Amino acid sequence: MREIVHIQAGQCGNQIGAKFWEVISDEHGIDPTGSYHGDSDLQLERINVYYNEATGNKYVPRAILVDLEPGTMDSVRSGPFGQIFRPDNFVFGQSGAGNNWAKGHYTEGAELVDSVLDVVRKESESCDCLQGFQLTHSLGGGTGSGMGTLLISKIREEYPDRIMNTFSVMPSPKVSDTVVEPYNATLSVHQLVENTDETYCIDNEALYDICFRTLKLTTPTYGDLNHLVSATMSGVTTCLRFPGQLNADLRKLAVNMVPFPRLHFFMPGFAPLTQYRALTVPELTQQMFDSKNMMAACDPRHGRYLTVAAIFRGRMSMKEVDEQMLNVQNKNSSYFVEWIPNNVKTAVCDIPPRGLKMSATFIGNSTAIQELFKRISEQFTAMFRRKAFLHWYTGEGMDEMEFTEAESNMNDLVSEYQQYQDA
Amino acid sequence: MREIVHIQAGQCGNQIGAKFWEVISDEHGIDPTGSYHGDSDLQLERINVYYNEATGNKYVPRAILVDLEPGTMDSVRSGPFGQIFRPDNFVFGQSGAGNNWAKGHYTEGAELVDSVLDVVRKESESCDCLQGFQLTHSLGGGTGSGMGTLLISKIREEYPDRIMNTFSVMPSPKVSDTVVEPYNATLSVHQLVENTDETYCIDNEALYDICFRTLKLTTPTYGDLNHLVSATMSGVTTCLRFPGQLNADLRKLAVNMVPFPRLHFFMPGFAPLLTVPELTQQMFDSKNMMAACDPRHGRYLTVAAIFRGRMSMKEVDEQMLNVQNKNSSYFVEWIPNNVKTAVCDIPPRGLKMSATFIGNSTAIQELFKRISEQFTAMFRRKAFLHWYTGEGMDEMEFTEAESNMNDLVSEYQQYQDATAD
Amino acid sequence: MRECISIHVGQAGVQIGNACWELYCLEHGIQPDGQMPSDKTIGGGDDSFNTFFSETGAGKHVPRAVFVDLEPTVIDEVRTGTYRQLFHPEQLITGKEDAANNYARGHYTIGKEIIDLVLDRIRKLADQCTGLQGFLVFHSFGGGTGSGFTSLLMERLSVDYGKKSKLEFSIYPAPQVSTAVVEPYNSILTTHTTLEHSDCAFMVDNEAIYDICRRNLDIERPTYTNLNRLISQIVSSITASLRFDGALNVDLTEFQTNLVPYPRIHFPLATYAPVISAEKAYHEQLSVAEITNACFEPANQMVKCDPRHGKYMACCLLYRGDVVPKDVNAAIATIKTKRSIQFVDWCPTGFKVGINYQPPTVVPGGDLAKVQRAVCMLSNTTAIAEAWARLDHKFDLMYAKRAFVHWYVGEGMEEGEFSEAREDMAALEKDYEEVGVDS
Amino acid sequence: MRECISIHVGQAGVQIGNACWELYCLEHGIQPDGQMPSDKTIGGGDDSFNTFFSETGAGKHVPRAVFVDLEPTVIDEVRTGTYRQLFHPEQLITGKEDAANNYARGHYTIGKEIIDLVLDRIRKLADQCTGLQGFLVFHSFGGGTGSGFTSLLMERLSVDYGKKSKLEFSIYPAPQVSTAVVEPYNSILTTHTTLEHSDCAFMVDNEAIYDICRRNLDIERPTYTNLNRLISQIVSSITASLRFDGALNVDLTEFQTNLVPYPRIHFPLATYAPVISAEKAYHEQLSVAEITNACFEPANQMVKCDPRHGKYMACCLLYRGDVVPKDVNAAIATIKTKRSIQFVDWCPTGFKVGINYQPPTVVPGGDLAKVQRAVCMLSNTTAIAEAWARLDHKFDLMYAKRAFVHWYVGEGMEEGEFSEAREDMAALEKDYEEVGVDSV
Ligand SMILES: Nc1nc2c(ncn2[C@@H]2O[C@H](COP(=O)(O)OP(=O)(O)OP(=O)(O)O)[C@@H](O)[C@H]2O)c(=O)[nH]1
Ligand SMILES: Nc1nc2c(ncn2[C@@H]2O[C@H](COP(=O)(O)OP(=O)(O)OP(=O)(O)O)[C@@H](O)[C@H]2O)c(=O)[nH]1
Ligand SMILES: COc1cc2c(c(OC)c1OC)-c1ccc(OC)c(=O)cc1[C@@H](NC(C)=O)CC2
Ligand SMILES: COc1cc2c(c(OC)c1OC)-c1ccc(OC)c(=O)cc1[C@@H](NC(C)=O)CC2
Ligand SMILES: Nc1nc2c(ncn2[C@@H]2O[C@H](COP(=O)(O)OP(=O)(O)O)[C@@H](O)[C@H]2O)c(=O)[nH]1
Ligand SMILES: Nc1nc2c(ncn2[C@@H]2O[C@H](COP(=O)(O)OP(=O)(O)O)[C@@H](O)[C@H]2O)c(=O)[nH]1
Ligand SMILES: [Ca+2]
Ligand SMILES: [Ca+2]
Ligand SMILES: [Mg+2]
Ligand SMILES: [Mg+2]
Ligand SMILES: [Mg+2]
Ligand SMILES: [Mg+2]
């Protein structure tokens, strides 16, 4: 039945993961106790994708919670919808990964991984027809970055043919915890380029800018950034959670969105950025393609679009939707590749998210994403040229050779992206 | 728990020794009967440094009186605070020393050293944690000079990691007793250069002049000189006996005062003989040195200064800094921050405020030169050597003492001229 | 009496299939529970409708059909639909996970495991047949199943039912109607693999049916339901010769005798008229000459192309309703000297004509107005080569960069099968150039 | 979990220890008999303050601390003082004879008599821990015990706890306060011995604290009691992240990642603001903008050096009290344009900010005014090598003539150990030069 197992690891992974469940639980009418209280059968028709049905018309998120420190775990368990999560699926250690990729991937994480796999394996046995896994995590810490990528490799070893889908938060000096985030992120991008089928790049720098420059918020918190992440996550999974003309799953999504295997990093976008005045469909499509609405700091105009998928939610003129999309394309055809015919697809969905009359969600595969990796790479080299802070890693058993490899593999990625920009 | 074992030997030894107990008993509130009659709790805090606690809050000096002749300790047990002294700790001979170093070190004094040892040992088993010993004697000749240095050497073999501290009174002809005093001094300096950790050079030459010129005394007596000696001894031992902001013992003083092992001979000073500015100034003046040496004919290796009485810490700091800057030339550069200053609340008897001076200065070589001059004058002509060879010594032993004292003066020069970069 | 078994593969064939059998039932008077009062012989009989329906002791008529899809979501709607009781449960074969728009996954990976089961279900139906004439395969070009599993099925059918005829109803992909980017790949891949296992294939271009629904029916955003009701009208016109008493196209081999003179060029073009909106309360019904004249308007063809700059190898006019031979000859006389009808010089310039007096039936509540006379024209024109040229060009654009190939190679296909299929298509276009053009 | 054991070694460490614990109690509402009425969990709990206090069945909260000194007189005050009932006797360990300002005596002759006993008491404390995080070691550079015994204790701890983290709060000697002539020797000696065993050291220059107490607090001649009360405020700001929970609070091990670029460069420079007197605080109300700016004034630094003449490798602002991010950011932007914050080229130019909501406390009868908001800046700057240079020159002046070296050799040391220690210091100074040079 196209069931998806959700895994959320680390502090960021659990806070955005936790908001995701709060939002989609709402859209499906599930209350914090897991009892259906909605008004439409549409809310229950794909409910088996993300929720496992317990006896007593009870719905339980098919979600696994992972962390090396017990804090955020307790934070979620007492948050709004904390009770809705299955207690057996809170796997957490005590030591913490100290924002150290090596601790999460090799030393501290290794002691806990098998515990997580037993829950993963448990939730999968409970699936008529497992579709794939999805993982929320940050790339610049330790548990999400390192243990996350470690789980993604262990899961691909036991489930070599399921789909691996991650929402990956990229680090930025504007919202920074420690200086070693380029190290943690470069080691992880390496893993992602090899063991995931689809990755949504959610760039904290972009999030910061959207809050600061557009929403007019001098002092943005992680709570403001996550509001945008959950909006986007809800929109990207619409076709998975609600009925529509579109009889598609994550594999069909990857076959059409990923023309070459290593280029599976997606630029997400959302409109309107969070209103009394209603938006117009021309306005929704106008913003969706605007650089200022991309959740990844890359100017789409600096590169070309390989594949585009847009999802409109709301009760709207499907004809006008279609007219406006062909306008943009015919208005920006110099930013789409001519060698992939008809590479901009649109899905409409009648259920609008709570709070908005209608919205659009943008999923782009664009060569401009290289700017993001170039940025990560510039900040990596500045430190690595002098081997600053390496001792936090070499003291956990890692060697410099492994940093050299990740950096090299990342530059290749940037090269691949730029090879298809001059087609 | 930092007990000190006091030992006084010879006429001079017991004389200045007796006064030392008169003064520090008065400061701590101990009457001649050993009963505590003071009014402050500061007087009893470090009392165990020099006193044992007897049944019924009776405090007994932790002292051992030694002499080769009963005609002196007889006196000691008659003066005020003579009953305070524990009667077993009297260890007196009979024959006498006859101002002959050899009789005190090799022949007569040896017959009696075992007897004193058992007393020093018994007093040491009593100590929670022994600091070391302090000896008041005299390089002038006989018991204190020759036997005293024998005791130092015998105690050292049994307490080698303890501190050996002497108050040594140097001979001067202005207060002379015998002609052979240069001979005895040199034989002792030869011992002290090798077997003590720190030695205060109380010089009868300086004491004579202070009484005469300064205190304008025409006919100075030993009473008058000793009164100086007491005032100084009370001073140099102040932070041993009271709980000042300084937390230190004999070994911590040695470590900061003695840059090289042989150069452990100090120049005491005392003022007055009245504000912080003058009190500091007199303290670095030659007229206040209990040693016939001009601080300005050599250089200070290290200096310690203790101010007693009620005064402003800040002014003390400022006045001590000004003296150094205005006399920078007279301090070696290779020992940074080599002047230290303590302040104690309670003053001495009869003074609103006093200051004591402990200098390790190369100018001390003048003292040694003086003795060396008088020694080499007699030895050159072989005068009186039979007194010593008749006890078993040979001229060789007289030569070593001279050649060793020459070097001692030679070292003090070497470092006086030493430069930094 | 000879039987015909229909096979519906993938989402497009299953739904198009649903629509046709709904129409077949309304046309022969069969109830949604398989009853047929028209039929007086209970449990048997050799009537013309028995080529598409078998009967039971209980008087129930069952389509000679099999529905196969690699995921249950579309067939389930048939299992709980209005004609749920009309189908035996074993006629409906569903899988666990689909082919993800991946021809390789449908033909090689998932296909290998489900092919034998399907062939058994087909055998079960062939056994009940006393003269099977062959099969009608309904499928899309673009679906991973419609493209990939179909071509494996067509390969096997040629083995287990050698002498029999295979006819194909194919849905050509158009971006106006839900298409994935890789659909050009699946189209060439399946066309090459199946080109020698199909005796005759009717392409329907979703672009064409889309516009017809917009122009003639005034539907702003046509849905699959709108499209499939119009498609199954064309399909019903093509198969009626098999289901009703008649003389023209009485069995699958006449389609190839009348329409396919060269084997590889077995792609006839369907035009159809009149398409009239049921929302038009009044609308004068056209004459025979008029509906005939419309068969030569590009607007009414199942594939957008211009037959005027091509040559014909065969035309076949199939009228349904109130049509007298006298009026048919009159129109044909006129449309010869009016329009541009080039025939290839090695073929007679003529028209095989059929008339079925029963007029088109309309699904009640459908979009189509009832009409007293309608016609369907099957012509074999080199013009249709346009649809191959458009498709092959899109193939070229992506394949030059190797885009999306890794998904196919990853299911076990060899990259060289791309070049083989494309090289075959490059020959197919040439076969049309040599047949048609001149210096 | 995350529990810290605090070891106070020798007079300076013990007397700094009193100040700190008195303050912690006042910060958490713990009484001198150890009762904490606000604490509802009797006999246990996993609260933030529990990282420094254990609990007994009777509701007593006992510091996770050991006091060690080679003579009793300084601990005896703790034993008979106001917080005497706070510690168990077994936590207060003293010998009979100290090290006499002699490193050789604290690390060998005397120290060996008592090291085993100290390590046994530490173990007992560590066994009461669910997740011992590390050790905090309070000592002076200049004393025989502070330098010699500390080095011995650190070496042993590396053997018994491996790479478990060890943090130092060190007292750097200054002539104005109360320094012995040999303190430059004990300083270079212990710095060299502990260097490979210390994850991070906070030096407090006595000359800096002394000057601050005079200028800012209007104290003619500051005493040890004056200096320690100020030192303990700095110590409290650094550990505040460990003892208090908060939405915007950052853990000290997170700053530690940004404050240590390389193992040997582990000496952050601390600054604290405001150090004002009640007479002056009655008028001025000091904003986040003012106290932040004050951290970049050379004269407010726990170590006397000139950061304008160096380069930054990390800057952490630790705020506590009535402070909100909007103001912090606004402040940092001002500083970021009016001052010479020159960073090295190989690390970002950000400022890492934590904010603790609990406001500063002051001991009753102290010299600091009660304020609504304070800040402590932990910066890693090459400028701090100036302290190494000053101390190394004094060492060289004496060692060139072997002055006082006989005291050390008499206890068992070899001249080789002196030159070895010095050469290490030499490398350390060169290490600070190189991190500052620009990349290729
Ligand atoms: N006319 C028409 N075209 C359809 C219909 N359903 C799908 N299509 C078209 O067929 C193509 C997609 O093929 P599908 O039938 O969806 O695919 P499938 O056979 O299920 O294959 P997989 O889903 O990949 O396993 C697209 O070009 C669609 O526009 C339908 O009901 N009618
Ligand atoms: N800030 C501060 N410095 C102190 C304190 N006590 C001593 N110091 C300094 O520490 C150095 C001396 O170290 P101490 O702690 O006295 O010595 P110790 O560790 O007891 O060593 P020993 O007694 O020699 O065995 C000097 O530089 C003093 O100024 C104190 O309470 N506060
Ligand atoms: C499960 O949700 C989705 C699944 C898919 C698509 C998609 O984008 C609208 C989705 O929503 C995010 C999709 C998108 C991209 C394509 O290429 C641009 C394509 O041809 C193909 C598609 C989808 N097919 C169509 C015709 O829209 C199937 C895969
Ligand atoms: C037992 O009492 C004393 C003990 C000491 C000292 C001293 O002189 C002030 C004393 O009073 C006589 C002392 C002296 C000299 C120093 O400087 C050369 C020094 O650094 C070291 C000191 C003392 N240290 C300090 C900081 O004054 C410790 C040893
Ligand atoms: N958008 C967002 N980023 C976060 C959040 N929490 C942490 N981050 C970022 O993630 C990185 C730190 O990873 P974190 O999740 O704290 O570490 P982990 O627990 O070891 O995985 C930094 O770049 C933070 O800015 C959050 O709630 N939202
Ligand atoms: N200041 C002082 N010097 C003394 C005293 N008695 C003797 N001397 C000096 O000590 C030297 C003689 O030593 P003395 O103690 O009399 O002889 P001993 O008993 O055989 O050691 C001479 O230089 C005397 O001037 C005394 O009471 N006070
Ligand atoms: Ca019948
Ligand atoms: Ca508690
Ligand atoms: Mg974090
Ligand atoms: Mg005499
Ligand atoms: Mg399908
Ligand atoms: Mg001490």
Author numbering:
A (entry chain B): 1 to 42, 45 to 276, 282 to 360, 369 to 438
B (entry chain D): 1 to 42, 45 to 275, 286 to 360, 369 to 441
C (entry chain A): 1 to 439
D (entry chain C): 1 to 440
Sentences from the paper on this structure:
Here, we describe a multi-reservoir, high viscosity extruder as a step towards automation of sample delivery at XFELs. After commissioning the device with lysozyme crystals, we collected time-resolved data using crystals of a membrane-bound, light-driven sodium pump. Static data were also collected from the soluble protein tubulin that was soaked with a series of small molecule drugs. In two commissioning beamtimes at the SwissFEL Alvra endstation, we validated the general performance of the multi-reservoir extruder and determined 13 structures overall.
Third, we demonstrate efficiency gains in ligand-soaking experiments for structure-based drug design (SBDD) approaches by solving the structure of the anticancer target tubulin in complex with both small molecules (some of which are approved chemotherapeutics) and with new photochemical affinity switches for the optical control of tubulin function. Due to its key role during cell division, tubulin is a classical target for anti-cancer therapeutics including drugs such as Taxol and Vince alkaloids. To demonstrate how this could be exploited for SBDD, tubulin crystals incubated with single ligands were loaded into individual reservoirs. These reservoirs (loaded simultaneously into the multi-reservoir extruder) were sequentially measured without disrupting the low-pressure helium environment of the Prime chamber and without entering the beamline experimental hutch. For this part, we determined 7 crystal structures: apo structures for both TD1 and T2R-TTL, T2R-TTL complexed with four ligands known to bind to different tubulin sides, and TD1 complexed with the photochemical affinity switch SBTubA4. Here, we used the T2R-TTL crystal system where there are two possible colchicine binding pockets available since the crystal system is formed of two copies of tubulin.
